Amino acid sequence: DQRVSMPYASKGLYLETEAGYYKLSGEAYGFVARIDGSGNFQVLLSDRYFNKTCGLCGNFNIFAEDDFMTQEGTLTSDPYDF
Amino acid sequence: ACLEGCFCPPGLYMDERGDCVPKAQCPCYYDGEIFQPEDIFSDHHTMCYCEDGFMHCTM
Ligand SMILES: *[C@@H]1O[C@H](CO)[C@@H](O)[C@H](O)[C@H]1NC(C)=O
Numbered sequence: 001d002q003r004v005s006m007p008y009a010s011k012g013l014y015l016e017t018e019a020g021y022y023k024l025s026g027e028a029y030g031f032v033a034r035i036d037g038s039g040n041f042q043v044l045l046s047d048r049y050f051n052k053t054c055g056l057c058g059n060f061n062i063f064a065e066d067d068f069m070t071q072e073g074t075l076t077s078d079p080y081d082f
Numbered sequence: 083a084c085l086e087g088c089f090c091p092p093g094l095y096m097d098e099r100g101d102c103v104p105k106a107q108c109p110c111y112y113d114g115e116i117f118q119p120e121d122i123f124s125d126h127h128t129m130c131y132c133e134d135g136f137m138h139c140t141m
Pocket residue numbers: 051061062
């Protein structure tokens with residue numbers, strides 16, 4: 001809850017700005033997040049989690065049709081209830 | 083038909099406890115089962131919830 005300043009680098013997470021746009025790097029944990037001025041979340045994620053992860057950005061597999069596997073794990077046709 | 087009796091205004095729907103309520107907390111009776119207005123609910127294979135009085139199942 002304590003508002004901190006920026007940049008900020010605690011716990012192996014470097015919270016920096018790049019090209020006038022804000023970045024959060026977690027290279028130790030294998031990800032890079034950022035935001036632009038307009039507000040557009042982006043997540044670059046390492047192939048280590050290939051067919052490991054599952055969330056709102058789908059699984060990191062090759063297929064692009066099966067990546068709605070719910071928190072239980074259910075291929076749901078709907079992009080909404082998922 | 084167009085019957086005669088004790089109703090309550092159309093914004094309100096009849097609850098089991100003698101009060102009538104808006105459809106927000108109006109429970110669901112899926113399989114008869116009286117689901118509370120917010121009940122997330124599912125086998126491995128089905129997936130079901132009670133929204134507003136209707137029970138939204140899927141598979
Ligand atoms: C992903 O891993 C599961 C086991 O957790 C396996 O059954 C499935 O075939 C794998 N799929 C890919 C894309 O490698």
